[PDB]
Design a protein around this nucleic acid. Structure first.
Ligand SMILES: [Mg+2]
Ligand SMILES: [Mg+2]
Ligand SMILES: [Mg+2]
Ligand SMILES: [Mg+2]
Ligand SMILES: [Mg+2]
Ligand SMILES: [Mg+2]
Ligand SMILES: [Mg+2]
Length: 210
DNA sequence: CCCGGACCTGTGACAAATTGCCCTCAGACGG
DNA sequence: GGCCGTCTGAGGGCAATTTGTCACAGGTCCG
């Protein structure tokens, strides 16, 4: 199945995207890499890739597309808009989109890679972000270990404000996304908390491949 | 000493958002 | 050639779950 590769600068960028938007973004990066910024998406192909009906594919594409407007991306800093023209459909079942050509070099550069089947069943977009960050440190054989700082997790994934209270961070983000990865990818993930005084400062992740 | 206070933890409630489903009906095409 | 039957997909919606927010119980240490 398709092998996504991307510059680490994207793995570590600050942005806020939905699951459906992140799914489309993987195909754009794939289209661009296999070569102005003009990409295309077919309804019926999207449906087959992610096991959706044609109707629900159409709904997902259409709503993802109008929610890109005004979204912006920050590389740590420098901010860019994803799209520089609205999306549009020349033919029935077909969409044409205009990615910011100044984004091309951030996509293709020190890189991260995974096959698309590894991520296509994940539902929570923050769990997609976490699985991408871990892949960045994976070894050939399939294992790795990394310590991520909590403030940088909050900044980069643009987590919502109530997850600055640590018990809510644990309950609604960390535990849920470690559970998804363990249930929905071929990765097996564990972690431990690093402390300084009363405050928890980092999370230490270890993982292997099944 | 014990206080009120500034920190930290977890859980019960409720609000807001997202999920896969379901139904309608016109577009595109070919036999 | 041209209508119609079928495969699509662009709409309109739904209830069940998940995600996002905050009050209050209950621990520690400080001055
Ligand atoms: Mg969302
Ligand atoms: Mg949907
Ligand atoms: Mg403290
Ligand atoms: Mg004594
Ligand atoms: Mg008392
Ligand atoms: Mg009690
Ligand atoms: Mg008390």
């Amino acid at each position: 199945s398709p092998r996504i590769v991307q510059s680490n600068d994207l793995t570590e960028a600050a942005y806020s995207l939905s699951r459906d938007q992140k799914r489309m973004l993987y195909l754009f990066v794939d289209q661009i890499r296999k070569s102005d910024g003009i990409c295309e998406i077919h309804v019926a192909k999207y449906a087959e890739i992610f096991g959706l009906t044609s109707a629900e594919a159409s709904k997902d594409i259409r709503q993802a597309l109008k929610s890109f407007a005004g979204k912006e991306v920050v590389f740590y800093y420098e901010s860019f808009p994803w799209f520089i023209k609205p999306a549009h459909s020349p033919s029935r079942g077909l969409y044409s989109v205009h990615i910011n050509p100044y984004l091309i070099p951030f996509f293709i550069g020190r890189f991260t890679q995974f096959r698309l089947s590894e991520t296509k069943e994940i539902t929570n977009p923050y769990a997609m972000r976490l699985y991408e960050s871990l892949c960045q440190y994976r070894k050939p054989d399939g294992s790795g270990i990394v310590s991520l700082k909590i403030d940088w997790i909050i900044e980069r994934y643009q987590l919502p404000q109530s997850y600055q209270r640590m018990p809510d961070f644990r309950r609604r983000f960390l535990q849920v996304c470690v559970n998804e990865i363990n249930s929905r990818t071929p990765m097996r993930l564990s972690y431990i908390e690093k402390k300084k005084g009363r405050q928890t400062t980092h999370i230490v992740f270890s993982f292997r491949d099944i």
